[PDB]
């Protein structure tokens, strides 16, 4: 991993030692080249996972998440340029450094071999995330959004820290490979049931689980666009990735311990998807859509089947690209009229025909049109849950209906109908903006062509 | 003060703790604590206003009372065993009043009420001495008798200090009072681990000191006594915004900053001794500290509060501060977690 | 009232530079930022990254496994052995409890 991490660290001096007129062109270009180098992790010609050293590894679960992380950094930079163009030069460089910091921290997080190392990097990400939300968010509610985000995470993370220390005191190590091979059955004591919850809650809050999700709609509505991109695409996946790594040592208590969280997720995914039908704020709508999708990820990880893990891995990647695309699409209208109210701008297909095409594909991805990886992940999750209990299809069926309703509702409301023609400041789409949309959507199509790369650990 | 007075008084402030740390005899340790009390009073009251007089008086009566209780324990032990050091055979009540009186000297809760008031009434550079240099002598005594101390009293003092340091700091708009509550919370962590691993007490003391010293220097740069005063930093000395933010997050124990290390290691050691419930309670309520530090970070570097017209005249003036000790401590208090194995053993 | 700037007015980015690409107000900086994104993002990463992934051989030993399966199916059938047995481990290698 050092041949990926070291060049990423060199982006920081590159940012600060570049001329003001070359900073964006420089950092974006090398960020693309670093994404290219991360593809080396996909050269996997056997079934032994790559252990580069005692500290860094990569297997079929972390490899897609590392590459998606590397790809997001250039995309976030392009997304940020227009709304930062009034900041002075030092403030622009500070913002870029925050974005690089997350890229470095997240790549290290997904390749860490030891759980307290994962925990430290997992917690470190809050610092640049909070700074981005609160220093560059637009509204007065960005400060409250920062508090919710930081402290929903932290209250769950403290029990996680206790559990990790406890496991290490008992086993002698937090190395993941050794924990895997030497794992032994747990007794079903009250003490072990609290251990299960301490190991799971921080990851479940991060997903977020329905019930403790209020931080996420707040954080998205208030964050700048690059903050929304990283939060929806990668940061939520830390919880799902954490749950998959740590659940190997929690057997057999997950068989009964999972029931309340399957119930919250399967019912909760209907509550949050139905909220999207009556949401007046476009960013909030996309955010609630994420909570509904991540509810599926929670359910499939909880039932721990080969299909359920594979469907969760695909959905994690597919949602990452799709939701980041939707935030970028919404931000392009906001940068023109400076409102997130969905019903304000209307008939936009009349004036932005190619941007409306990007809107349609993002919406078709979101409602899981086959053969997209969006549908493939949701399909295999549905099959595994049906096996777990045939009555799950009732709640799946309701969510599928509602997801089509709000996905097409967003398109009809904003792109169709009569143009709101008092909006004479609807400047034509930027080349940068149209390029940004394509950089989301080409990988989604390419991954649909070769879905072996995101199947995860079980297939 | 003229130079002769400064030299004598500062020398006595330095001398007392050195006597306490080097003494075999418990009476000479008490003498060292006596030098500290006597020498620091004229510095506390140097500026001579009603608030500084109140602060010096409250400090004197608390410290002198605690000193008498410590002396009682020393004398009772001399009566019991004919020696001038505490032993394994020292009566447990004698050791419990030593712990009580030293914790009152340190300002641990529930003997804490004086400390936020005295810190508020004195100059910032004296608050710095009060919360750093003056902790060393009473802690040094405790570390010597760590196998003799009662774990029950310690943990109750420790959890109480963390709880009241947290809730105490939540209501403050005065910087000197926020630092005092930050002191009490960190002393709660130092004390909790003392009977188990006194080396980790010293690790926490060192990291607390190198966090607190540059935080006081940052307040001293413009004499920022309140949240609203420190919120003008963006206009007066914006270059400090990065390091104040990281020092505040380090004081709150957020990873990957150096201040995460003391909380992390103490939890590890407490749970090696099955002190799981206290460690959980301690770590959970320490998050409340991060809340009021974050609110402080919100008003300094992450938003820009309204400024005033006279501040433009300040921008015309050159400053000669901070000294380069600020940068050294600021960097080592925030960016040294990668060197954690070299700090614990 | 306090002393505060008025809000800035809406600006049309294309009024001064009708060839604006979205990257910069300086035209020359703008076009080169556009070219770098298209060259490194698309010409390099998306084309060569796609090519490199396409020619990763035997990804996760899927080609070897099918090749190995055909060898075993062939072997197990000429010799009359079962294609696949219920017991992964030979029972002779296992010592069950007496009870």
């Amino acid at each position: 991993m050092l041949k990926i991490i070291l060049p990423s660290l060199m982006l920081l001096p590159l940012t600060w030692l570049s001329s003001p007129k070359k900073t964006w062109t420089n950092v974006t270009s090398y960020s693309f080249l670093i994404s290219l180098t991360s593809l080396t992790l996909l050269w996997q010609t056997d079934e032994n996972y790559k252990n580069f050293s005692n500290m860094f590894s990569s297997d079929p679960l972390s490899t897609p998440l590392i590459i998606l992380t590397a790809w997001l950094l250039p995309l976030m930079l392009m997304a940020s340029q227009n709304h930062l163009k009034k900041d002075n030069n030092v403030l622009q460089k500070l913002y870029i450094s925050m974005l690089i910091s997350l890229q470095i921290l997240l790549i290290m997080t997904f390749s860490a071999t030891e759980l307290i190392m994962f925990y430290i990097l997992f917690e470190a990400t809050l610092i640049p995330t909070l700074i981005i939300i609160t220093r560059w968010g637009n509204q007065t509610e960005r400060l409250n959004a920062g508090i919710y985000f930081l402290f929903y995470t932290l209250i769950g993370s403290i029990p996680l820290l206790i559990a990790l220390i406890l496991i290490q005191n008992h086993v002698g190590t937090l190395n993941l490979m050794i924990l895997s091979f030497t794992t032994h059955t747990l007794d079903a004591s009250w003490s072990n049931n609290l251990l299960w919850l301490a190991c799971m809650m921080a990851f479940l809050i991060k997903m977020p689980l329905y019930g403790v999700h209020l931080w996420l709609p707040k954080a998205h509505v208030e964050a700048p666009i690059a903050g929304s991109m990283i939060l929806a695409a990668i940061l939520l996946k830390l919880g799902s990735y954490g749950m998959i790594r740590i659940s190997i040592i929690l057997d057999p208590l997950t068989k009964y311990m999972a029931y309340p969280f399957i119930l919250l997720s399967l019912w909760g995914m209907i509550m949050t998807s139905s909220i999207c039908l009556r949401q007046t704020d476009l960013k909030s709508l996309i955010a609630y859509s994420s909570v509904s999708h991540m509810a599926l990820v929670i359910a499939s990880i909880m039932i721990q089947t080969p299909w359920s893990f594979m469907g969760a891995t695909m959905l994690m990647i597919a949602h990452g690209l799709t939701s980041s695309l939707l935030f970028c699409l919404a931000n392009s209208n906001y940068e023109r009229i400076h409102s997130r109210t969905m019903i304000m701008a209307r008939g936009l297909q009349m004036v932005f025909p190619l941007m409306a095409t990007w809107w349609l594909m993002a919406s078709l991805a979101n409602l899981a049109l086959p053969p997209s990886i969006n549908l493939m992940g949701e399909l295999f999750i549905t099959m595994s849950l049906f096996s777990w209990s045939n009555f799950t299809i009732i709640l799946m069926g309701i969510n599928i209906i509602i997801t089509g309703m709000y996905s097409m509702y967003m398109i009809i409301t904003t792109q169709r109908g009569k143009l709101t023609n008092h909006m004479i400041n609807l400047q034509p789409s930027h080349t940068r903006e149209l390029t940004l949309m394509a950089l989301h959507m080409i990988p989604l199509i390419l991954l649909t062509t070769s879905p072996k790369l995101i199947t995860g650990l079980t297939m | 003060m003229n130079p002769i007075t400064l030299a004598i008084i500062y020398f006595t402030i330095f001398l007392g703790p050195v006597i306490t740390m080097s003494s075999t005899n418990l009476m000479l340790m008490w003498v060292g604590l006596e030098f500290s009390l006597l020498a620091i009073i004229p510095m506390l009251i140097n500026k001579k206003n009603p608030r500084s007089t109140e602060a010096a008086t409250k400090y004197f009566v608390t410290q002198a009372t605690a000193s008498m209780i410590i002396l009682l324990a020393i004398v009772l032990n001399y009566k019991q065993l004919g020696t001038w050091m505490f032993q394994q055979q020292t009566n447990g009540l004698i050791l419990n009043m030593t712990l009580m009186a030293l914790s009152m000297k340190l300002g641990l809760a529930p003997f804490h009420f004086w400390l936020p008031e005295v810190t508020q009434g004195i100059p910032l550079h004296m608050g710095l001495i009060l919360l750093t240099w003056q902790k060393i002598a009473p802690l040094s005594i405790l570390i010597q008798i760590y196998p003799l101390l009662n774990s029950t009293i310690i943990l109750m003092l420790a959890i109480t200090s963390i709880f009241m340091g947290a809730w105490g700091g939540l209501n403050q708009t005065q910087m000197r009072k926020i630092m005092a509550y930050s002191s009490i919370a960190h002393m709660g962590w130092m004390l909790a681990i003392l009977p188990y691993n006194p080396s980790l007490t010293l690790l926490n003391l060192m990291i607390y000191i190198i966090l607190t010293a540059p935080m006081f220097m940052a307040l001293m740069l413009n004499n920022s006594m309140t949240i609203n005063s420190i919120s003008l930093l963006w206009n007066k000395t914006p270059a400090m915004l990065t390091m104040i933010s990281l020092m505040l997050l380090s004081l709150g124990g957020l990873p990957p900053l150096t201040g995460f290390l003391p909380k992390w290691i103490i939890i590890t050691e407490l749970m090696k001794n099955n002190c799981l419930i206290m460690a959980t309670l301690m770590a959970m309520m320490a998050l409340l500290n991060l809340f009021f530090y974050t609110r402080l970070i919100y008003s300094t570097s992450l938003t820009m509060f309204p400024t005033n017209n006279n501040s433009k005249m300040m921008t015309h003036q050159t400053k000669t501060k901070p000294n380069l000790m600020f940068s050294t401590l600021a960097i080592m208090s925030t960016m040294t977690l990668p060197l954690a194995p070299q700090l614990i053993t | 009232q306090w002393q505060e700037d008025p809000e800035p007015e809406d600006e049309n980015v294309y009024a001064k530079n009708p060839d604006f690409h979205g990257y910069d107000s300086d035209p020359v900086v703008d076009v080169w930022n556009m070219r770098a994104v298209f060259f490194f993002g698309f010409s390099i990463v998306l084309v060569f990254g796609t090519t490199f992934v396409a020619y990763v051989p035997d990804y996760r030993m899927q080609e070897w496994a099918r090749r190995e399966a055909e060898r075993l199916v062939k072997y197990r059938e000429v010799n009359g052995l079962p294609i696949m047995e219920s017991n992964y481990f030979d029972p002779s290698k296992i010592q069950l409890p007496e009870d």
Binding site: N138 | T173 | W2
Partner: peptide, 19 residues
């Protein structure tokens, strides 16, 4: 619209003796 920054009413909530 311009980024919101604290106004007098926001800053005055730290001007009290306590929070």
């Amino acid at each position: 619209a311009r980024q919101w920054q604290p106004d007098i009413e926001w800053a005055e909530q730290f001007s009290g003796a306590v929070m």
